[PDB]
Amino acid sequence: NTEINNYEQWKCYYDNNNNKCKMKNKVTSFDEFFDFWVRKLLIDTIKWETELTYCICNKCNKNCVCFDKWVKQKEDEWTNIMKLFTNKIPKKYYLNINDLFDSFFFQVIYKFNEGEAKWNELKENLKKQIASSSEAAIKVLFNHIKEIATICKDNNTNKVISVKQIAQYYKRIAHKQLNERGSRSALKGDASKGTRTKIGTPWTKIVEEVFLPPRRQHMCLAIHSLLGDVLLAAKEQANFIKNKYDKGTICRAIRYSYADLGDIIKGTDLWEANPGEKNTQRRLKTVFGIIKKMPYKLLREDWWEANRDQVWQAMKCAMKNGITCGSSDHTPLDDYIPQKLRWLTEWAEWYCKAQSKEYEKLKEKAACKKYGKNIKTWEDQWKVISSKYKELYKQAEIYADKPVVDFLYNLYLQNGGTPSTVYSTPEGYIHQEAAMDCKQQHVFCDKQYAFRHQPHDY
Amino acid sequence: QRLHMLQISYFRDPYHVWYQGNASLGGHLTHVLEGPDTNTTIIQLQPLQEPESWARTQSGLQSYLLQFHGLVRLVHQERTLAFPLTIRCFLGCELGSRAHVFFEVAVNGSSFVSFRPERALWQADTQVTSGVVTFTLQQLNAYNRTRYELREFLEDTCVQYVQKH
Ligand SMILES: CCCCCCCCCCCCCCCCCCCC(=O)O[C@H](COC(=O)CCCCCCCCCCCCCC)COP(=O)(O)OCCN
Ligand SMILES: *[C@@H]1O[C@H](CO)[C@@H](O)[C@H](O)[C@H]1NC(C)=O
Secondary structure (H helix, E strand, O other), X not given: OEEEOOOOOEEEOOOOOOOXXXXXXXXXXXXXXXXXXXXXXXXXXXXXXHXXXXXXXXXXXXXXXXXXXXXXXXXXXXXXXXXXXXXXXXXXXXXXXXXXXXXXXXXXXXXXXXXXXXXXXXXXXXXXXXXXXXXXXXXXXXHHHHHHHHHHHHHHOOOXXXXXXXXXXXXXXXXXXXXXXXXXXXXXXXXHHOOOOOOOOOOEEEOOOEEXXXXXXOOOOHHHHHHHHHHHHHHXXXXXXXXXXXXXXXXXXXXXXXXXXXXXXXXXXXXXXXXXXXXXXXXXXXXXXXXXXXXXXXXXXXXXXXXOHHHHHHOOOOOOOOOOOOOEOOEOOHHHOOHXXXXXXXXXXXHHHHHHHHHOOOOOOOOOOEOEOHHHHXXXXXXXXXXXXXXXXXXXXXXXXXXXXXXXXXXXXXXXXXXXXOOOOHHHHHHHHOOOXXXXXXXXXXXXXXXXXXXXXX | OEXXXXXXXXXXXXXXEEEEEEEEEOOEEEEEEEEEOOOOEEEEOOOOOOHHHHHHHHHHHHHXXXXXXXXXXXXXXXXXXXXXXXXXXXXXXXXXXXOEEEEEEEEOOEEEEEEEOOOOEEEEOOOOOOHHHXXXXXXXXXXXXXXXXXXXXXXXXXXXXXXXX
């Protein structure tokens, strides 16, 4: 008495025989239905993994998402089949992975060129997952197709080649290196196995030259234990910003904090001056060492890569504020943008908020000895920022700080590198990557100059 | 001397099969097989094979039976198969030069197919080739699992048992 989801739909019956299932109107026994569904699940799985192999330019984002939708649909159909039994079921349906493949060997390889290879590769991948984790083959398969859908969605993440496009390049490299080491099946954890405010304020200037966002200052089985701690911190930061911190503001703050958290875990962060941050970083060295005995940054790069979807989903908790803006699996590429770039992008956004806050005081030439001065204070920080960008950009030119120089020249090579289009000038960088709320002082390049004393209008 | 292995598979449904079988070493019963595809018990009557080897052997035999059933289901799905269907498989190895092996399958008592290791190929025994016969031979001659891994069973694993016991 259960129904199993321009396609087929079925109504199944099941006894303790006439334990038939009905689709003109095809009527089969339940056992035939089950077999039909299972062999199609296995055949379709192999075809999907094969088709997506080249991505596992936007053409495969569309195909990759379709795969994830497919995976979820099949998982629901599976649940509906289990509703016919409601008893946590004989081996006739509970095939072991070795049993399932031995039983469906001919039916599935029949559909493929070099099918014995595809049937084998799938068996080995499923055995590897259960070995890491005599369970039913269908459940192990579902976990396998879910991991692939997640891995693929990460690769696409929904005249000028942007920082986001280059970040995707580094993302694709990241998993590539991970895939070659092959450790993700070991490093991906399972949570169930575990346990300033003012806008007009200039950024803190730290040498022992980087400006530290107030947002970063206000930051909240060793693998399973670590993932549980990271997920908790991620959830807390998301709730912290949501409840204690604009739409664009709330989204960028959560997303940048996510990227900052990845930097902390990877150990590639800039703010190493703070003793609380140092205490945290030492705890990470300790846990990852424990993990290794399988600065630990290269393994950490993999572990965070093996566990970035889990961390991101944790940051979407308890909210109706969509943050799903330009990414697949709603997962951003910000953790693949060198921190110095994201903080720069961010500085400009905070600066233009500061300019508007001061601008707005000039309403109902004495008051312009505060604005155009508060402006000067923020103007100086840009100077420092602009100079450092130019040094690294020029190194990239000659090449075409290591992660930034390598990011820039690869971005430059894809942007005319041989004149550079829009990224050779840091003012130009901000005008391509950041969003400015400033009023009447919209130009960083030196009438409507971003740091002018008095706006051309006032 | 030799092994003469026999199984009879009674398919009341493509998805419902009763298996029964045995094996004789030389002239005497050594093994039996009986039960449905979901609960088939394979018993060594003369416990001459080490328990570990035997467990591995049973696993291989169960794998065989599941693959066998899968082949029948596929044949029935692609080519219509009438039920009840009785499959009778007779296979063996005989030993003073290189061993002789054979494998022949009859359907409802009528020899349907056989294996010829010389080219690692299956061919029909029946003089009447039809869609079922052609399709069954394909799977047999398309996969290394049915062409060469079978030879290791018949020309190596089977004979080692015969030579040893
Ligand atoms: C040392 C112990 C020696 C044995 C002692 C006797 C044991 C008791 C036997 C009881 C009687 C049962 C008789 C039925 C045959 C059982 C033997 C199966 C042999 C076999 O085919 O190969 C196994 C399965 O592998 C494969 O993958 C090949 C199977 C593929 C299917 C072939 C086609 C089936 C016939 C066509 C039917 C068509 C009907 C259409 C209507 C190999 O197992 P292994 O892993 O150990 O490998 C070892 C090296 N390869
Ligand atoms: C399998 O068959 C034995 C008898 O050979 C019987 O005692 C046992 O209960 C059966 N098990 C199942 C699951 O049918």
